[PDB]
Design a protein around this ligand. Structure first.
Ligand code: CLA
Ligand code: CLA
Ligand code: CLA
Ligand code: CLA
Ligand code: CLA
Ligand code: CLA
Ligand code: CLA
Ligand code: CLA
Ligand code: CLA
Ligand SMILES: CCCCCCCCCCCCCCCC(=O)OC[C@H](COP(=O)(O)OC[C@@H](O)CO)OC(=O)CCCCCCCCCCCCCCC
Lengths: 34, 62, 90, 80, 73, 159, 742, 141
């Protein structure tokens, strides 16, 4: 592995932050009456 | 319509007794009845009833 | 003796607040002033959600990247020899 | 919001309206079967889908048919 | 769980769970928007089939890979 | 003392009872004097108090039983986990406030007392009220976690 | 007031109602139009309160059915005794109870099944039984096949007698409703007469025949040289040779100087050191005390002799502030409804069966019982299953009562009304505690599994890592271990060897009992037991309370106790009756009892049983791997299922082959249950039409139209096949394991 | 017929219950049922428990419509008591529902219109494959 510092950057940014923000966005879109 | 005690075979496509025979009981002879013929069958349906009324053009085979 | 009315409709639907303390002030005015001048800008939810997401992102970034070798087990890597393949593989 | 229908085979048994536990089906004057009676569903906005109506009509297949449609609070039978 | 037990039990359970949530202090400040109801009938069948299928696939993929690759024939 | 069970507000057609647990002088006093039920006080102060309490209590189950509960960084990892939990809860509170509250509605809170007095609804059930509550809770939680860590792993008086 | 009431010849015995198959109910007495008549005939064949409406005929039918059931039980018992007499190696077993496997069944050689007659020892060949009848007969003093033959005949006689009574009290002299309602005299006679005199008679038999014969059997004499059980009755001197207290005659009992009966009326804990069972000199004293207890307790309730209590003034007198009008109107419930009595009786009898199953394994009452591991395991599992079934039956019958016997016009008596009026609270709190228990019990196992999978065992919940030692059970054990010195000065030893006190006892190799340790692995499984029991109570109590009405269906009591669903409306209302709650609770009862029996099996094979050698070294069967390997589900998968299931699977070609066959048979039945549990009536009813078409095409259409099983019979069949398959699988596995390795 | 008007009649005696009104009754509709009795009996509540109705007029408010119809059918069958029930909105707008024209929906009555009545046999509806890209379903025709 060349970088070897990217897996420590991405899986925290894809298994923790990505769901945390997309679930919030989708919850705002679901629970709205427009 | 048909005679009393006559054995007629059904043609109603959505009938439990389709293509089955039954003997008329008493056809009502009122002026504005849409299904006057009354026929009783010797085998109940899924609901359990054996008598049903049809129109004269809806069942005849003799 | 009667439990219905169209005027006082809230009496006949159970809209009472069973525990209401109407006290307008409970804490020290100085302490309240020193608490609202510091936790006041945090009121803007539009400018708080986008603050929290970036704070958490950068936090799990710096902590995920600038970790320690002794703390983590996936960061300390293997410090032994690897086992061999059951069919003479490696 | 379910759709009730009464086809022209009701012999006026009056059982459909006796069975419906929501005051949805009612009798109506309509000459043609024996007694100038027929069923009528004016209050379909209250049917929950109980299908007690269909379980009562002693017709060949059926004369009152319930079609489950859009769901609401009244039709879901909710009390909360 | 989704194939043996059917809806009329779970709805009558949710109807008292909602009561318990409404009649408690310090927790009736929050409030649901969508009324909680039990899963539908065809929906329950679908979820049950999905669980059955995912489990059926996984517990055999794991076995076929472990028992073979652990010996390599 | 004769018969301690009663319907709510003396109305039998509501879903509950006035048991000694729900309705009682000591219980009603203790429950009315809680920051979430004090009505007239500004939402920001209640949020600050509640966040302080929760962030202060949360440091326990994180430091004593963690994945690094046996290292020199014993307390720091638990304090960081507590701060993470409070910011996550702040985010959940924010999205709840956005989804459940509008910027034009007057109030969803109850307005009457136990005896039908025409009081005023709680300002917490407004959009800006919940925003202030969320900000105050964020601040209180962070400050409480920090104070707990200061008292535990900087000073004396072990437990 | 209380008197005999009989109506002479209320029903002429004949064969008329016998030729008409459906006769009890008029709805199906007409004839089988469709094939859903054969089914509901047997369904409501025993629904006595559904055929008619008067309590009198219902009570008479109940009485006669009880008599028939007693006759069947008597036939069963006489058959077991006759088999022990004719096809058993009992006399050979008596000469060497530690090397001869019990067996009382032989198989005809027809199709190669001859190999089921395994070599059990003593020159015999037959299936090895596990009923524990040999130990019971050895403890009773039975020492010859003759003494079995006779009693077999005896049983048969009683059978006929019972049948006669069953006919008599329905056809010649049947009582009337006013006679059954005398519950005061009924309880008086069941306390003083049935239990008291029964215990006194058994204490007499013990103290006269069972004590000397068993003592001479412990002294190592030949079971043929032992005098017959009447040589100790017509010779007080021949009996006093062992217990010289008999030389003092019946005088100590009448002068209150009976502290000299300490020879045969003892108070000594522990087990007999040579038989691994209780001291019969102790059980005789126990029965003698229980008899007088029940006798003096059988004088409480009032009859026509002036004195005594009345169980209506007792009830109304208990009426507190919190609980409305007290127990008023409950004496009217339990004397005008057979279901409200069956519920309580079934609940108490099931709980009592569980208590029995827990007591017998810990205090073996029969000689050489703790040694034979197969018998001690079967007697636990069987009784556990029986109790688990009876409690669910109690729930079902309470629901039935609530559905069609309860009425409010008299039940303004605010005890049942008050608990009916906060069901939405009772069930809510039971649901919350069920969730809490489920999490804090099973999530711990999942934690341990994930940790042991992530190569970090130091973070587990083991006995080396974070500990969960149950301190209260350990304190109770230490308290009962010291009782014979402080809190029981006359008892020589503790009541059981399972308490931490005491030591080990051997029966010639294999160990009988020893102090049982309790660690975290026991904490977890006890909390799991609590969780499953709580979920079962949740389901059953929810059904019972919402049997009448709910927010979903306010008029459910009009629909009845047993009905599939109220339409696909309201989102869906499938499985909404109380019958469906019993259907759902049967599975959780099965789960709970299966977990209990797995717990018992593994813990006993791991920390109790074994075979000690000289110098004291004791090696248990599995090797004490329960404290460490039972904290993870993988451990229960390999160390219990995979490991112990290695005896049944490879039992082909041996005397244990039938267990290996019934393993797969029960697996098939269990999997077969899923076809009914998952599917629904509409698909099968439609499919049947395409077969009726092929039949009509060839003029083989039956006159009884083939309808598919009702929506409730499908569920009944599914749960029945499920339970049969599961229990039979566990039966085969347990027996094929313990017979070979125990 | 002029629909009967609500009043402030008393309520049946009841010690309470946990199966009463909920928040749905203050943000949405709720129902109330009345009747007249000649004595004081004990009647079973459709929400669990028993209550003693009072002589003369009685008024009871519930949470659904099916509850009112269940209680009313039980009354009309066991006690021979006639009844009505209404639906009340949050803003106090009473709406009269059950005996809409005085006569219960079982007995025929003049001045009643037929709704949802199709002039054909149920087995005559057209297939759902001709009325595609046309929101007429199969039966509204
Ligand atoms: C669908 C294809 C695919 C899949 C399943 C994965 C899976 C994975 N990648 Mg990855 N990757 C991919 C394509 C893919 N990669 C491509 C094309 C690139 C080049 C840009 C990379 C570059 C990359 C890096 C640099 C790293 C990973 C890493 C990882 C692992 C952790 C997840 C993560 O951080 O992702 C992060 C993913 C990205 C930064 C880029 C995403 C790539 C494409 C655009 C996503 C494909 C979209 C997808 C089809 C839509 C999904 C729909 C679904 C939700 C229904 C995981 C095994 C990490 C690792 O090795 O950890 C051990 C890591 O450090 N990936
Ligand atoms: C397993 C859970 C757990 C654990 C390990 C701890 C651990 C601790 N708590 Mg704690 N606590 C808990 C749950 C827990 N708490 C709960 C549920 C509450 C109720 C809100 C509290 C309320 C509480 C207070 C009020 C205080 C502690 C304090 C403490 C510390 C000294 C004792 C210690 C770190 C004390 C502390 O840290 O003071 C500096 C202290 O004052 N706890
Ligand atoms: C309910 C079951 C359960 C329990 C008790 C635990 C417990 C634990 N797990 Mg765990 N785990 C579980 C299931 C469970 N696990 C499952 C199912 C999985 C797989 C998905 C895992 C996977 C897992 C991992 C991967 C890890 C753990 C770890 C841990 C430890 C620290 C966790 C932590 O920070 O908690 C913090 C707890 C809190 C923030 C809340 C505490 C709850 C409070 C005290 C409730 C108080 C209520 C109060 C008394 C009510 C009264 C109020 C009144 C005063 C007014 C701890 C021993 C970690 C470890 O290393 O352990 C050594 C770790 O890395 N777990
Ligand atoms: C002497 C012979 C005799 C005769 C001619 C009759 C005749 C009659 N009895 Mg009667 N009865 C008898 C003996 C007899 N009884 C005895 C000995 C008992 C005591 C158990 C009863 C108890 C009894 C009751 C309680 C009732 C009758 C009733 C009746 C009438 C209808 C019976 C009927 O059609 O069901 C025929 C029923 C059967 C053939 C079923 C027999 C099943 C037996 C009893 C149990 C066998 C169990 C066996 C071990 C199998 C177990 C499972 C196995 C598959 C493994 C009829 C007048 C009924 C009546 O009059 O009500 C209107 C009624 O309610 N009888
Ligand atoms: C519940 C009671 C019960 C049960 C399960 C059995 C079961 C059995 N008995 Mg049996 N039996 C019983 C009561 C019972 N009996 C009673 C009460 C008597 C006394 C009349 C007998 C007298 C008896 C004899 C004399 C014989 C059997 C035999 C048998 C076996 C073969 C029976 C057969 O195929 O026909 C079978 C295992 C036969 C057997 O095992 O052959 C070796 C055999 O010869 N039985
Ligand atoms: C918890 C146990 C208990 C209690 C509290 C009582 C209490 C009572 N019994 Mg009683 N009794 C008991 C057990 C008990 N009994 C048992 C086990 C038997 C047998 C009896 C047999 C008995 C008789 C025969 C009589 C009483 C009577 C009485 C009453 C008068 C006795 C008194 O106070 O002097 C009193 C209410 C007398 C009475 O009139 O009661 C109504 C009476 O005549 N009892
Ligand atoms: C003291 C014991 C006792 C008594 C007297 C009764 C009596 C009664 N029960 Mg009941 N019940 C009991 C225990 C008891 N039960 C237990 C323990 C349970 C829990 C499982 C139930 C669950 C239960 C339900 C769910 C229902 C009843 C019903 C009834 C009534 C009609 C029963 C009937 O006609 O069955 C006729 C008998 C049969 C159709 C036999 C069925 C065959 C069984 C299921 C299989 C046996 C398997 C066998 C052991 C081995 C299989 C292999 C072999 C066959 C080859 C009757 C009053 C019904 C009712 O409506 O009450 C009014 C009803 O719906 N009971
Ligand atoms: C293995 C299968 C299975 C499982 C897990 C369950 C689970 C449950 N059943 Mg159940 N059930 C099943 C089969 C199963 N059932 C079957 C086959 C039937 C037919 C007879 C029933 C019939 C039935 C009835 C009739 C009832 C239940 C009830 C319950 C609940 C009891 C509450 C509890 O203990 O919560 C504990 C929950 C668990 C232990 C599930 C695992 C949770 C893990 C450990 C935590 C994971 C951590 C985290 C959340 C993961 C996040 C993932 C994310 C990051 C992606 C629970 C949800 C009762 C109920 O509703 O009570 C509330 C109830 O009344 N069930
Ligand atoms: C071990 C379990 C088991 C067994 C022995 C059967 C056996 C059978 N199933 Mg079956 N089934 C099962 C489980 C099982 N099923 C399960 C779990 C499901 C899912 C609900 C089904 C769904 C199913 C359907 C949908 C059909 C069968 C059919 C059949 C029959 C096919 C004819 C045959 O092989 O002989 C047979 C009786 C077919 C049938 O009726 O044959 C004519 C059929 O149409 N089954
Ligand atoms: C445990 C409580 C206990 O001690 O009960 C005591 C109390 C019974 O008091 P009373 O004196 O009303 O009851 C005595 C008799 O009236 C019959 O119960 O029970 C209740 O209040 C209901 C229990 C609900 C328990 C909630 C859990």
């Amino acid at each position: 592995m060349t970088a070897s510092y990217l897996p420590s950057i991405f899986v925290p940014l894809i298994g923790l932050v990505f769901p945390a923000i997309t679930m919030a966005s989708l919850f705002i879109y679901i629970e709205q009456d427009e | 319509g048909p005679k009393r005690g006559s054995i007629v075979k059904v043609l109603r496509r959505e009938s439990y007794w389709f293509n089955d025979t039954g003997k008329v009981v008493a056809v009502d002879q009122a002026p504005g009845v849409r299904y006057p013929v009354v026929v009783r069958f010797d085998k109940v349906n899924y609901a359990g009833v054996s008598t049903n009324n049809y129109s004269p053009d809806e069942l005849e085979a003799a | 003796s009667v439990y219905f009315d169209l005027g006082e409709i809230d009496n006949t639907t159970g809209n009472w607040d069973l525990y209401g303390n109407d006290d307008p002030n409970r804490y020290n005015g100085f302490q309240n002033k020193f608490f609202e001048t510091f936790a006041g800008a945090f009121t803007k939810r539009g400018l708080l959600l986008k603050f929290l997401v970036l704070g958490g992102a950068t936090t799990i970034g710096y902590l995920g990247s600038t970790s320690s070798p002794d703390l983590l087990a996936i960061k300390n890597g293997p410090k032994q020899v690897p086992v061999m393949g059951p069919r003479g593989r490696k | 919001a379910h759709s009730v229908k009464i086809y022209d085979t009701c012999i006026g048994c009056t059982q459909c309206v006796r069975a419906c536990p929501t005051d949805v089906l009612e009798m109506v004057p309509w000459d043609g079967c024996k007694a100038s009676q027929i069923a009528s569903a004016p209050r379909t906005e209250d049917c929950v889908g109980c299908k007690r109506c269909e379980s009562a009509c002693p017709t060949d297949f059926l004369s009152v048919r319930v079609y489950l449609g859009a769901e609401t609070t009244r039709s879901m039978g909710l009390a909360y | 769980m989704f194939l043996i037990s059917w809806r009329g039990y779970w709805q009558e359970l949710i109807e008292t769970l909602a009561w318990a949530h409404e009649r408690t202090p310090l927790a009736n400040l929050v409030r649901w928007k969508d009324k909680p109801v039990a899963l539908s009938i065809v929906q329950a069948r679908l979820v049950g089939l999905a669980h059955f299928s995912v489990g059926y696939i996984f517990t055999y993929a794991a076995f076929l890979i472990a028992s073979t690759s652990g010996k390599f024939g | 003392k004769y018969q301690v069970i009663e319907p709510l507000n003396g109305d039998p057609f509501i879903g509950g009872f006035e048991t000694p647990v729900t309705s009682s002088p000591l219980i009603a006093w203790y429950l009315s004097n809680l920051p979430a039920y004090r009505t007239a006080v500004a939402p920001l102060l209640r949020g600050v108090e509640i966040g302080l309490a929760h962030g202060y209590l949360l440091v326990g189950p994180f430091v004593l039983t963690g994945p690094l509960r046996n290292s020199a960084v014993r307390g720091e990892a638990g304090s960081l986990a507590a701060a993470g939990l409070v910011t996550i809860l702040t985010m959940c509170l924010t999205i709840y406030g956005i989804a459940s509250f509008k910027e034009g509605e007057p109030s969803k809170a109850p307005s009457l007392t136990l005896t039908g007095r025409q009081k005023d609804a709680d300002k917490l059930q407004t959009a800006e009220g919940w925003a202030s509550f969320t900000g105050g809770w964020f601040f209180g939680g962070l400050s409480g976690v920090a104070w707990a860590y200061i008292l535990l792993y900087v000073l004396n008086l072990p437990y | 007031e209380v008197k005999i009431m009989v109506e002479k010849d209320p029903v002429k015995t004949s064969f008329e109602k016998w030729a008409k198959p459906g006769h009890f109910s008029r709805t199906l007495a007409k004839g089988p139009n469709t094939t859903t008549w054969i089914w509901n005939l047997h369904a409501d064949a025993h629904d006595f309160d559904s055929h008619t409406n008067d309590l009198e005929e219902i009570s008479r039918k109940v009485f006669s059915a009880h008599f028939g059931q007693l006759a069947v039980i008597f036939i069963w018992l006489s058959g077991m005794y006759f088999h022990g007499a004719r096809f058993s190696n009992y006399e050979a077993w008596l000469s060497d109870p530690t090397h001869i496997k019990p067996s009382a069944q032989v198989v005809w050689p027809i199709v190669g099944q001859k190999i089921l007659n395994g070599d059990v020892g003593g020159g015999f060949q037959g299936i090895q039984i596990t009923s524990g009848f040999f130990q019971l007969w050895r403890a009773s003093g039975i020492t010859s096949e003759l003494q079995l033959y006779t009693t077999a005949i005896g049983g048969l006689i009683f059978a006929a007698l019972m049948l006669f009574a069953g006919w008599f009290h329905y056809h010649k002299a049947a009582p009337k409703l006013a006679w059954f309602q005398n519950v005061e005299s009924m309880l008086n006679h069941h306390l003083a007469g049935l239990l008291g005199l029964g215990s006194l008679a058994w204490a007499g038999h013990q103290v006269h025949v069972s004590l000397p014969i068993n003592r001479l059997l412990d002294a190592g004499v030949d079971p043929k040289e032992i005098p017959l059980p009447h040589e100790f009755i017509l010779n007080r001197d021949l009996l006093a040779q062992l217990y010289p207290s008999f030389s003092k005659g019946l005088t100590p009992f009448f002068t209150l100087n009976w502290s000299e009966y300490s020879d045969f009326l003892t108070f000594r804990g522990g087990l007999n050191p040579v038989t691994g069972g209780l001291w019969l000199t102790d059980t005789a004293h126990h029965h003698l005390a229980i008899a007088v207890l029940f006798l003096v307790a059988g004088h409480m309730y009032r009859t026509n002799f002036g004195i005594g209590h009345s169980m209506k003034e007792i009830l109304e007198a208990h009426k507190g502030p919190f609980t409305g009008e007290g127990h008023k109107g409950l004496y009217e419930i339990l004397t005008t409804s057979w279901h409200a009595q069956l519920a309580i009786n079934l609940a108490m009898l099931g709980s009592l069966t569980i208590i029995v199953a827990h007591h017998m394994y810990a205090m073996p009452p029969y000689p050489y019982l703790a040694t034979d591991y197969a018998t001690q395991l079967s007697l636990f599992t069987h009784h556990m299953w029986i109790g688990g079934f009876l409690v669910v039956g109690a729930a079902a019958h309470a629901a039935i009562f609530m559905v069609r016997d309860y009425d409010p016009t008299t039940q303004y008596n605010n005890l049942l009304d008050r608990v009916l009026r906060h069901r939405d609270a009772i069930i809510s709190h039971l649901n919350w505690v069920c969730i809490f228990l489920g999490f804090h019990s099973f999530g711990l196992y999942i934690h341990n599994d994930t940790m042991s999978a992530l190569g970090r065992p130091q973070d587990m919940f083991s006995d080396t890592a974070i500990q969960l030692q149950p301190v209260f059970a350990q304190w109770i054990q230490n308290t009962h271990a010291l009782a014979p010195s402080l809190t029981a000065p006359n008892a020589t030893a503790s009541t059981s060897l399972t308490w931490g006190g005491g030591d080990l006892v051997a029966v010639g190799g294999k160990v009988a009992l020893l102090p049982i340790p309790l660690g975290t692995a026991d904490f977890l499984v006890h909390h799991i037991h609590a969780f499953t029991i709580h979920v079962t109570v949740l389901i059953l109590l929810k059904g019972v309370l919402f049997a009448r009405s709910s927010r979903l269906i306010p008029d459910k009591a009009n629909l009845g106790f047993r009905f599939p669903c109220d339409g696909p409306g309201r989102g869906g209302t499938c499985q909404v009756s109380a019958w469906d709650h019993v259907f759902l609770g049967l599975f959780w009862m099965y789960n709970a009892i299966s977990v209990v029996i797995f717990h018992f099996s593994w813990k006993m094979q791991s920390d109790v049983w074994g075979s000690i050698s000289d110098q004291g070294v004791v090696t248990h069967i599995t090797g004490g791997n329960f404290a460490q390997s039972s904290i993870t589900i993988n451990g229960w998968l390999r160390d219990f299922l995979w490991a112990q299931a290695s005896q049944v699977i490879q039992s082909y070609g041996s005397s244990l082959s039938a267990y290996g066959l019934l393993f797969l048979g029960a697996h098939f039945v269990w999997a077969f249950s899923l076809m009914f549990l998952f599917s629904g009536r509409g698909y099968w009813q439609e499919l049947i039409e395409s077969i009726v078409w092929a039949h009509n095409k060839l003029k083989v259409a039956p006159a009884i139209q083939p309808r598919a099983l009702s929506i409730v019979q499908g569920r009944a069949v599914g749960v029945a096949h499920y339970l049969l398959g599961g229990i039979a699988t566990t039966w085969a596995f347990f027996l094929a394991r313990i017979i070979s390795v125990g | 017929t002029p629909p009967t008007l609500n009043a402030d009649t008393p309520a049946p005696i009841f010690g309470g219950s946990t199966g009463g009104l909920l928040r749905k009754a203050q943000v949405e509709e709720f129902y109330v049922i009345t009747w007249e009795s000649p004595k004081e009996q004990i009647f079973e509540m459709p929400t669990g428990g028993a209550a003693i109705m009072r002589s003369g007029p009685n008024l009871l408010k519930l949470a659904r419509k099916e509850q009112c119809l269940a209680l009313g059918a039980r009354l009309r069958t066991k006690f021979k008591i006639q009844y009505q029930f209404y639906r009340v909105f949050p803003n106090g707008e009473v709406q009269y529902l059950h005996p809409k024209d005085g006569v219960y929906p079982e007995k025929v009555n003049a001045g009643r219109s037929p709704v949802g009545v199709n002039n054909r046999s149920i087995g005559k509806n057209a297939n759902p494959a001709e009325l595609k890209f046309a929101h007429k379903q199969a039966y509204d025709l």
